[PDB]
């Protein structure tokens, strides 16, 4: 069974590196699609309909001039390069990408069930089996990403989508970095930052296992382990080495969380000799059939409402703006590789 994982990951690395070294480019164009509705804004993500087939997709649109202004060139190129190269059940699939005079476009599978964030705030909190179901998918996803030397760095309910079968899709790779060892960028979201990032140390993929602990805590509690009015105050609590648990947390859950929310990155679960297996073998996961999760054969605890293709009810409403395409090419040299 251990040899099956080893062989599986080696094959997956060979497939990733092939696509990483020769990325796909320019596989559709804007007028192949009708715009339907804005699903999210920051650029924008829109529900679109492919005219020829009638298939719906989520199209991320990035304004090249805005990307340059916000100093996001490398992050944007990197996100698209990662997405066209990875392949895993809980990672959103990139169907097409192209660019024009004004914008960059990534057309992804439409994931109709909405952000985990919305469901968690609506319901309040998840029961431990509901939380465990999602957590198992993140564990496997990070095992895959880390085997490719990818550090993810932006785990949070806002960045997890729920598909039609109730399984998770991870979408956003703008802060992911492919490095074998340590790195130094201050990046992420305050509530989810590992202490060694806050402390301006070099850090490694162990930061993702810290963030998994924050996520499990927030799913099971309804609020994250470290919060405050201002980020600086959140940082002080994170590095303090103190955390408090709701009284309804089970003993097994608290012990897992003490080992993921471990300030000493040399004692943190996922970063020890046995790597991810310390997490998979932990008592809280004793009922988890890891292969069945990967194979998507486990009955999901929650299935979002879905009327049919194009239903956007699990997403909020945003002001609709034109998709404008300038007569002049903008920022061509910067985005040659896209």
């Amino acid at each position: 069974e251990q040899e099956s994982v080893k062989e599986f990951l080696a094959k997956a690395k060979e497939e990733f590196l092939k696509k990483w070294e020769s990325p796909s480019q320019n596989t559709a164009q804007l007028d192949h699609f009708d715009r339907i509705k804005t699903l999210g804004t920051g650029g924008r993500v829109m529900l679109v309909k492919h005219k020829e087939t009638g298939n719906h997709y989520a199209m991320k649109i990035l304004d090249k001039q805005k990307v340059v202004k916000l100093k996001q060139i490398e992050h944007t190129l990197n996100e698209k390069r990662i997405l066209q190269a990875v392949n895993f059940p809980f990672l959103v699939k990139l169907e097409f990408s192209f660019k024009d005079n004004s914008n960059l476009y990534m057309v992804m599978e439409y994931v109709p069930g909405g952000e985990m964030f919305s469901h968690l705030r609506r319901i309040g909190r998840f029961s431990e089996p509901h939380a465990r179901f999602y957590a198992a998918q993140i564990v496997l996803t990070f095992e895959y990403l880390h085997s490719l030397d990818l550090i993810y760095r932006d785990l949070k309910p806002e960045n997890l989508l729920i598909d039609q079968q109730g399984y998770i899709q991870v979408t956003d790779f703008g802060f992911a970095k492919r490095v074998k060892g340590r790195t130094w960028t201050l990046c992420g979201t305050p509530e989810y930052l590992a202490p060694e990032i806050i402390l301006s140390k070099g850090y490694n993929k162990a930061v993702d296992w810290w963030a998994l602990g924050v996520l499990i805590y927030e799913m099971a509690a309804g609020y994250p382990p470290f919060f405050a009015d201002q980020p600086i105050q959140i940082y002080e609590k994170i590095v303090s080495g103190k955390v408090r648990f709701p009284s309804h947390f089970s003993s097994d859950l608290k012990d897992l969380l003490r080992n993921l929310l471990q300030v000493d990155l040399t004692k943190r679960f996922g970063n020890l000799k046995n790597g991810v297996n310390d997490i998979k073998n932990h008592k809280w996961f004793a009922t988890t059939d890891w292969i069945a999760i990967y194979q998507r054969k486990v009955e999901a605890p929650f299935i979002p409402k879905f009327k049919g293709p194009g239903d956007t009810s699990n997403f909020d409403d945003y002001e609709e703006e034109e998709i404008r395409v300038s007569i002049n090419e903008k920022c061509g040299k910067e985005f040659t590789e896209f």
Partner: peptide, 18 residues
Amino acid sequence: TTYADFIASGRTSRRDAI
């Protein structure tokens, strides 16, 4: 309560990256 403190934080909406 801790939940009350969470609501009063003003960080219950979608959180941006730094």
